[PDB]
Ligand binder design. Structure first.
Ligand SMILES: *C1=C2C(=CC(=O)C(O)=C2C)[C@]2(C)CC[C@@]3(C)[C@@H]4C[C@](C)(NC(=O)N[C@@H](CC)C(=O)O)CC[C@]4(C)CC[C@]3(C)C2=C1
Lengths: 171, 169
């Protein structure tokens, strides 16, 4: 199930995020019209594989910015939980300061809209979605919980979609 | 469709063109006990798909080392698949294959895996990693213009196998 379909508008959302400046902020996917978006879910805060993924995307956010691409992470934890994790230094097992926003999905409706809810557990799988600058979903990636994602592979995909966007442009 | 992470991957029985060039009816369940990479491509005689098919075929031994069977699939007929296999690579053909290519002419396999492009009766570039028990572990779906990476697929297969395992010495 879910409503994430290739070639269709990616499901919009409006949710509280912890922004890179460390403050909250209600943001919507539609805020990022005109930019590509990498939108990725992770199961929950304060775990072992997820911080390595989050820090990798945050550390390399400049490479996405050079592609006019916004990276957004998300999980079902509360926005206070996200902020606590950001405020915990990397040296102590936290995220430390972030270059990307982290969305809170406490009612699980965004995870359900993207088809990545592990219903038996109330957490999301490791879903990653590439959305173009028109808001159209271009790529779906979902990993079972034990195996993380690759920033290199994500950049390869974003670059490839932008390259092919140039043949016979819809106008 | 019915492809859900953590659930049995949808079975199928379909005619494939096999590496030896002959047609055989195969099923996903034929490969229980091994990991499976099952990937869809839109149509034969296209220009992005042959790069992927040839790469998976060329590197099939790297999947064999991981006890992993690679299977490709498209809605085109198995006769079309073999015609492309038999076309010289010099003329844009696939050349001899190390992997089977499944034919999905009824579109039911693509629908079961949730990768049918409904307005155009062909599959998106869906790729599915299925473990040795038949459970779906990974979903990858690309829009038509953008191909997949064998390196990334190998990384994922190996990582699922490692985490499946973890002597307490
Ligand atoms: C190409 C197309 C457009 C829509 C469409 O359906 C189609 O098939 C093609 C090939 C758009 C996206 C529509 C908006 C355009 C034309 C935009 C707008 C404007 C004001 N021109 C028009 O709206 N033309 C309409 C109405 C007179 C028409 O009937 O042709 C100025 C041109 C401009 C800015 C640029 C192109 C496009 C974005 C466009 C192109």
């Amino acid at each position: 199930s879910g409503n994430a379909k290739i070639g269709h508008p990616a499901p919009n959302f409006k949710a509280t995020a912890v922004m890179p400046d460390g403050q909250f902020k209600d943001i919507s996917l539609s805020d990022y019209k005109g930019k590509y978006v990498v939108f990725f879910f992770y199961p929950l805060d304060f775990t072992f594989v997820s911080p390595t993924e989050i820090i990798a995307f945050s550390d390399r956010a400049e490479e996405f910015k050079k592609l006019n691409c916004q990276v957004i992470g998300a999980s079902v934890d509360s926005h206070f939980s996200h902020l606590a994790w950001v405020n915990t230094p990397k040296k102590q097992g936290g995220l430390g300061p972030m270059n990307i926003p982290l969305v809170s999905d406490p009612k699980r409706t965004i995870a359900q809209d993207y088809g990545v809810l592990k219903a038996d557990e109330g957490i999301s799988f490791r879903g990653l979605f590439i959305i173009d600058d028109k808001g159209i979903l271009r790529q779906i990636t979902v990993n079972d919980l034990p195996v993380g994602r690759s920033v290199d592979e994500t950049l390869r995909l974003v670059q490839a979609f932008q390259f092919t966007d140039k043949h016979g442009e819809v106008c």
